[PDB]
Design a binder for this molecule. Structure first.
Ligand SMILES: CC(C)Cc1ccc(S(=O)(=O)NCCN2CCC(COC(=O)c3c[nH]c4ccccc34)CC2)cc1
Length: 331
């Protein structure tokens, strides 16, 4: 027998109730502007499927960010465009300004509003325990918005969070792997980055949903408050689960697998072994104890769960006592 089906416990039928053209991105018509409106200034970074430059708009002389798309199925370009168009103006989501094709190369590129990245080396030694609570709240704002809009990000990881520390602005970026939730759909499990892949991805369980984003978010929190990056440091995808099982124990993992009737690769059938679920205090030490609190350890533990039904939702997470202080200051 095959796996047990699963449904998201919030925002389940949000896409069912919308007009079709909301989520049916394969038929979306995109009008491609001219990239020579823009002049590339300097590289900002480079992903596996993008290449980000700061540019100026030689018409209104404005800063702007141009992301050249790498050669991917037309489909997935329309999807990222559709999702960005669907989320424009939402809290802490990046803002799409234009969509262009270079005249000669004919390579597609997305054009976004300008943001400044804070010296990523600054963040290490400046981030107070409160600062983590704040920028984590901002991230849950963006995830709750987009889950309410029927979209999962599927690539939540620090290289996809823009922070402007001077102005305390955060933007969630790279929507190239984002996808619409449709109850009962089976999604590709070759998504996210290793260190942030949720258990459901490593065991190939295809009816995942928004809670995938809450696992990854738990990995960031894990790596922030313990100053251990990445927190589950896997040599490959099979090993990654073993790194997780050494922390979360195997008894819960094998419960997870029996509850969903997952069949397990014969590869796994000897590398996982037996492991107790470790206590979070094992990971505290003199140089991270100022970011670790009983509240943070409760909050973190309520995200890193095998069973995806039982992870917090973005909305429940923003209600955790971890965030009491920052909610107070927002008035
Ligand atoms: C919850 C806490 C707080 C955890 C945390 C710690 C550190 C950081 S971090 O900020 O240090 N992360 C390193 C990544 N940074 C941002 C991306 C850079 C490349 O790519 C782009 O810049 C754009 C891609 N698309 C865009 C659209 C508009 C503007 C720019 C881009 C590379 C440098 C964030 C969160």
């Amino acid at each position: 027998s095959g796996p047990v089906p699963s449904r998201a416990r919030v925002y389940t039928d949000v896409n069912t109730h919308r007009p079709r053209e909301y989520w049916d991105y394969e038929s979306h018509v995109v009008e491609w502007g001219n990239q020579d409106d823009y002049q590339l200034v300097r590289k900002l970074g480079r992903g596996k499927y993008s290449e980000v430059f700061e540019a100026i708009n030689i018409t209104n002389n404005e800063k702007v960010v141009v992301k050249i798309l790498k050669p991917v199925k037309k489909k997935k370009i329309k999807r990222e465009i559709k999702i960005l168009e669907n989320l424009r103006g939402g809290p802490n989501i990046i803002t799409l300004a234009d969509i262009v094709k270079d005249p000669v190369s004919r390579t597609p590129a997305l054009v976004f509003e300008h943001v400044n990245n804070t010296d990523f080396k600054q963040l290490y030694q400046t981030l107070t325990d409160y600062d983590i609570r704040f920028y984590m709240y901002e991230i849950l704002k963006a995830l709750d918005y987009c889950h309410s809009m029927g979209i999962m990000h599927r690539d939540v990881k620090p290289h996809n969070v823009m922070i402007d520390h001077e102005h305390r602005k955060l933007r969630l970026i790279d929507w190239g792997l984002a996808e619409f939730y449709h109850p009962g759909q089976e999604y590709n499990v070759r998504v996210a980055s290793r260190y942030f892949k949720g258990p459901e991805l490593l065991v190939d369980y295809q009816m995942y949903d928004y809670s995938l984003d809450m696992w990854s978010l738990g990995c960031m929190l894990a790596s922030m408050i313990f100053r251990k990056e990445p927190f589950f440091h896997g040599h490959d995808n099979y090993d990654q689960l073993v790194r997780i099982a050494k922390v979360l124990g195997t008894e819960d993992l094998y419960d997870y697998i029996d509850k969903y009737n997952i069949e397990l690769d014969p590869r796994f059938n000897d590398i996982l072994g037996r492991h107790s679920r470790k206590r979070w205090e094992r990971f505290v030490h003199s140089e991270n104890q100022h970011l670790v609190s009983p509240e943070a350890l409760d909050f973190l533990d309520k995200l890193l769960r095998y069973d995806h039904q039982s992870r917090l939702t973005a909305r429940e997470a923003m209600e955790h006592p971890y965030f009491y202080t920052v909610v107070k200051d927002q008035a």
